[model samples]
Target: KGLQIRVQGLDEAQEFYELESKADGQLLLSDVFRRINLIESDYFGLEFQNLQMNWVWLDPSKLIVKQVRRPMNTLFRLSVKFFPPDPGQLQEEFTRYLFSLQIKRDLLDGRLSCTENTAALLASHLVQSEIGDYDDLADREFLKMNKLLPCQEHVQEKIMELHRRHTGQTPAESDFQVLEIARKLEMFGVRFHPAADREGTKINLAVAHMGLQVFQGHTKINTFNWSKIRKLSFKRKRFLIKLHPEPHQDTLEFLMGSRDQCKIFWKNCVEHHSFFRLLD
Candidate 1:
């Protein structure tokens, strides 16, 4: 018997084909998706009957790919909602995408919102990334050209202003303040929602595909792993997290700020969990 593959949704009745050993036995996930004409990022992830390809763990390294006799049948479905990258998340992630900054996305997605002054400063750094130590002539020339970002007028004015303020520093040096200011804005990838316990000790709660997190301001206090969570529920202005054993907490409780917000947040969490984390 050889390995078998099926459509992602795992409908047993769906189309499937098996691989005969020594005959197309190898399968690269990327190649598989390409053949199916599916090309996407961010929200894309995978799961199998008893395995998980979870996100990277903290600042750790040592890439290890496990090779096991996996389930004979696997699926790769296109059922996920790619949450817009928080502008705050983008600022951190932007540096990593230098190889493929097919740019023009932040402006369209409303991720980068700032005064033209700040935009100009960022523009300078962007220029610096492409070329070495700032060339006074080319900087202005590049700024003057039609750019992919929106708000051309403001960007141009800001670039000029930045030209004057361009203190001699590395391109990395210039980005510190621009990002610092932008992150404090209302939507700077900083989505803060809080709910308290019965004792009135409060902690902010936020959700994403990975799982739920409890925070004290921007600092995370506790974590609720998606796999460990057996169930999530709400009662009145109260929220509950039912999960696997914890010596400290079997099922944690939090009191929402209001009835309406709790209702909306709870429903959103449920839908989000189902959309991304749960097997559809």
Candidate 2:
């Protein structure tokens, strides 16, 4: 039998697909990609949660059947893999559209927190793209029906005012505008993993396009660029990093609450570096 799989899109829409790759015939994850219309695909990947609930990015070079076992859910999520330092690097209109969807989802889920004005501006573009030029009744009803931002009602007036000014923007332009605003933001798509430096100082580690970040609470305290990192590894509850000898360049270590937690963060760092920094 063919692999029966489910994929959840960035918009939270799910699609079931029966991948016709033969078992043990070297059918790679890339084969599943053709069915999904994501172009400029280096910025995205299919992720599935393991039994332990740790998210794993599918290795395109690996066999699909081997990766998703019958014992598992066989559900993959199309997620943004690399958040570009500049959103404008997204070349295709379709790529931008998907990026916009991700940003919209981020906003709604409170992952991408922002000031009320910025939130209203982003939501305005969202409204414009969904429902062309603004009409008083249509705008009110649309806002009423859609959950764009948290506590959205408080920002309704500002969203309406911004939408009126976005009169001539087409959906594509609106999408582009949404990303344009989002790219300037701090931690555009960063997810923090809890860890501690050797001194028992609690720090959160997050990976992004540019570097691996160290945050003390919500404030970013340091960053180690990918170029500066020679290798990443983990042992038990310790996450390790070997920095390139651009200086003293020692292997830095951090403490994690659990071995699984350390491994999860390490896996993400590896994927981020491979996707964004590697040539192949």
Candidate 3:
């Protein structure tokens, strides 16, 4: 759980070395030597210092030990803590900060690096590009590649063109296409349902499913994972849905189906409102 370090210091460097060697020699005769053997190997009958013991005990036949001295090891303790930022706001802040640094540097230096200029231009292009533009949202291009949206061929071509325009390089057409559309759709609001919810005999699950699919594919940002889905459900519905790793396949199928239906229901409820209005 924690680490402790001890070092021997002397007025003379040679004396320091001698003291360290003596300490190491004593350590070889102590429990540390036995513990190292127990943990590392099952070999026995080796009475040597730490370095020598390590080399000899590891392999009794290979006594060829070579000591190549290098810089002294430096150790530092680290403390880590976790804190979360608001997802909707953090991206904007980060983007602004990135560009701000570039702007500051350019003003101070009277010129921007080629890399900096390229990055700034690309960021500007992304910010100005339409969220649903065929060229921007199509295929796996821009920062949205991680979202993995399923886009049309023409749209994919346009996206590649846009990317090429920025980078001044042609992209691979075949490799540019989305890999798994269904999986990406799940990141948005859509899901796959095997059975219908019991509202009534006249319940229309197909229409709702189609609505969810459309919303997921065309409108919503595809960034939500299972944890996000669970959080959203809990926040809005006052119900808890345990989204566990290695969930039963049947349970996943049911949840996926339910997610589809819920997506449609929510989309319809907020379709007419302004994006910010929905937040309010």
Candidate 4:
């Protein structure tokens, strides 16, 4: 009843927690999370992987939890989302929670990563939430903390650069909008690899446990299940995804920007698939 499972965070720090219940039928995945002292609203949900792992916000009620016996070779992080109830009362609470400083801190620390750009965009909103709006007149050193991402100064400029575009929105509304946009990107926790289709169109390719996605300008256009693809290969600047037998679509080919980018995309497919779906 008192076994501790340790999980690694993004910065390579590990933390331990134990799930113990003194009363029957009261133990939950949320209760276990309580041991770590964070409510669901504190962040999103738990994710188990290294590169921007997908945020799977589990259903808190009636979740039958079990230990996965230590194939735990990846970093774990929490999700960042809060879906308010339909009523206005809940929506108000939801908005209040969205503007929390912990959120700003989490975003600053790289807790919420979709893309380098996505994180930058969200951090800009965090800057807005705390400081109101852009003051082109304001000094460079002012409110610099939220302007950075994962402690990177370049991200400071990026976030501030983005904040200029979002000039009219109120702090809470801006934070809410960032929350909305960041949550829906399937690329959440996705490390994007740049590639192009043989048709001479630019696209980003991302692979995770769920599947692979083809993104055109950060908008996902196609998805191929790992089951759908029997193999991925590249020849020069050409990348090919060979489908499973008797498929509606047979081969997906992409003309890449370069031969090296083709190899990068193909290797990412193999890497994510092997890491998440492999028996090992």
TM-score of each: 0.41, 0.85, 0.18, 0.41
Candidate 1 residue-wise lDDT at 65: 24
User: Model 1: which residue pairs collide?
Assistant: 8-76, 8-77
**Which TM-score value belongs to model 4?**
0.41
**Candidate 4 segments whose C-alpha is farther than 4 A from its true place:** 1-145, 148-184, 246-249
Best by TM-score: 2
Q: Write the per-residue lDDT of candidate 2 for residues 2-55, one digit (tens) a residue.
A: 666777887678777666655431233344455666667767777887777766
Highest lDDT scorer: 2
Model 3 TM-score, all chains together? 0.18
RMSD of 1: 13.5
Backbone clash pairs for candidate 2 read none
Model 1 is weakest, by summed lDDT over 10 consecutive residues, at 55-64
Residue-level lDDT for 42 in candidate 3: 18
Candidate 4 lDDT over residue span 1-280, tens digit each: 4434455433234676554423221243354345444443333344544234533323333322332223234344444333222112324544344334434545565544467787777777766765667876451456442244665666667777887877777866765766566556554445566776767788877776567878897677988887778888989988888889786667888777788777766765775677557776
Q: For model 1, how does the per-residue alpha-carbon lDDT over 149-227 read when each residue is reduced to its tens digit?
A: 5766656655655555555655444444434444454333323467887689877787765577787655668767678
Question: What C-alpha lDDT do the candidate models reach, one value each?
Answer: 0.51, 0.81, 0.26, 0.57
Off by over 4 Å in 2: 20-32, 49-56, 59-75, 244-251
Error of 3 at 177 (Å): 20
Order by TM-score, highest first: 2, 4, 1, 3
